[PDB]
Design a protein around this ligand. Sequence first.
Ligand SMILES: [Zn+2]
Lengths: 397, 415
Amino acid sequence: CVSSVLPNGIHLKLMKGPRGVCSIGAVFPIGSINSPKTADTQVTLSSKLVESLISPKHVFMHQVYPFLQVNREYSYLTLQFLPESTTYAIESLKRFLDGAAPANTTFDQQKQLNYAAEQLGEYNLLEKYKDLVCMSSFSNKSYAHGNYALQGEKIDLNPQILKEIPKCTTLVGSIDMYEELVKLGGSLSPFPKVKLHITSNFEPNHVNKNVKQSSLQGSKISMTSSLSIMSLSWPSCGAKSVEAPAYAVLSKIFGGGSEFSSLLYTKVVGGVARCHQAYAYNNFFTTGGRFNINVVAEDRNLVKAAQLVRECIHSVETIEDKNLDAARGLVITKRFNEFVRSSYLGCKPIYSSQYKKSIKEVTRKAVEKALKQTFSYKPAVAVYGPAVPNEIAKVFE
Amino acid sequence: ISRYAVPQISKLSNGVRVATIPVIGEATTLGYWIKSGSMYENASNSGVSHYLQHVIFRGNEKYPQRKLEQLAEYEGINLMASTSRVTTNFNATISNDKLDVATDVLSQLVLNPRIKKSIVDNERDTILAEEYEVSQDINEVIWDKLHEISFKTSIGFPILGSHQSIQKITTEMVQSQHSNFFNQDNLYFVAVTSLPHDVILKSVEKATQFLKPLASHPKLASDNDLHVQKFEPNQKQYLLPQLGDNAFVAIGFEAPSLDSPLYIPSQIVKSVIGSKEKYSVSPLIENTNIRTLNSYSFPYGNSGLTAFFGNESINNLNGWVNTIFQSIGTIFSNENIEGSLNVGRLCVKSQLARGLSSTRTIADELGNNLLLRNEYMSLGKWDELLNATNINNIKEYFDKYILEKNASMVIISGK
Ligand SMILES: [Zn+2]
């Protein structure tokens, strides 16, 4: 990491590491919540993107690898390329930041893709867990706005946010892209806007996204499209907070897995016949966290599976010294994307030495504290499917 | 990252060759690369190479299944394996301190297995499971169907084997394959590392102290000329109504062998058609709205297959095929040949310089390079050949391989 603050106030975060592949991009505090509905932000930024790269033929001819992550509270764009493609890479990024609205033909093509997102493999089980946690565990109901429209509802271009991007952009890149990005940042507005955005508070809501899943998803006849997802969410800590290493450890204590070994694997997948998978994640937001446990099982088995998760919670109290350390071991592992993700949040990157230190540098003490404060909350309960969420809820009293 | 480097090879007195290439960082990928795979099988034993791979990772004498699990969780030793049509490897990617433990676990399992009738039979269901899983990726299904109708010879077998074949695999068969394919003379020990060539050579020496030299060298069962492939272009259509208003399509041509002067040319041609991603499609594709496109070209002994595939709605299926055939055609056009050469060449440079800061990737190429090439080929000297490749080379490839050839084709449809 190399942090500059440019002549015009724009920040620049450069990644350390050996040369060969060039990286540029922009991160900004605009996410899916800064538009009135699901996919509005997603389809908007997409439209801007495809226009900024002129054509897919241009992207191909220059062998540029673009990646756009739109989250609830913030978004980032990353381009990857070989040095001979710098000119086009920069120019394209400059176009993304210029604030102009895209043509409507572009927007229509882009919403077509968005409606088709599950069929094309763009709306996997990971993206569903997020949505469920986000439509269930927040007091502010606009966190329910995701990136992927329901077959029914509408999508609308949001111009405001395109004018807003240059006004709150931090630029990012590999160290070899310093002078190119300093020039780029220079051409932007002095000086960046500052807005107080805090993550919305926890609320243990009980919701359903009772929606049909496409049989074919990408190139797979999905093995899970007839099963339901149960997302149980509790509050944790922000990305920065001193508790985050223990919380990461705690997620791996829980762990998970499929078929086609930790607590959720042995207790929850083994315990429920026709349960494809279960996973725990510690998901971070601008100023908070959601610890979530996700179960993909038959609709009829969720209440059963919920009980087995409560057993799992109780088993953490008397965890053996082996696994309080094996879960420290399971926190060991797109290198640029983590650089950008961590940079916005303020945390240490998952690849860095300092972070892998933090893992060893927290014991049973800080783990127990974390388990204690988290599960002393009633869970948010979401279901992808028909299952009545209050039935699952009653499991936790 | 690496530095257009060249590997150091020493042979131990027990005949194990240790090959190391210098890297930067606290990363090390190391393991055994073995010329074993489904190219070397027949009707009677199809799937045995993959099957054996599995058994190997289900523990031996010194490290049974339990001791392996402990090493995963507690000791930071994580073990990966894969079986292709042409090669097999067993490896770990590690922190430089675990070297001695890792060389020992890896040597012990690969070179010193304990292949019981019990481990064999227990494992059967875990493999049939993998088979059903992979049968639900229709890209994998079509990829296999294309090989099957193209090659009456062994390359047309699926890596895992037919269901029938996964059923009938005996312990004697698994045993036999290890005996005939897992010897010092048919394999390499590969390390991509910052540690000097000698620290690895000393550590492997330690790990393989139980292994006695080979008495003689019977002609290796992996030898390409024992498994001559024959491409014959075929057309075959299949149903899968479960798919709905969707069809999958593959188009195949014979490809050059790895050592052919027309290998690189072929790789440039495949690459210029290339893949369709979210934001990126080939300049040769007239209809940019086509749902999905994948391009691959792989060498198999004397032969090889170049394949183009995707899915579309029943309605757009026929269109997809014309699109692809058109795009291929355009490459040969004098107005476009030169631009098709440069963009294709750029692609191949892009592809490779993208797997130069992953040491797993470096090790996989180093393994395959050593197992598959007359003699070794370095990135820089590859890059020379790529840059020396001309318009005449592309034409010459088009002549032997594309112009006036029948294509293999597979359609899997919902109607
Ligand atoms: Zn396998």
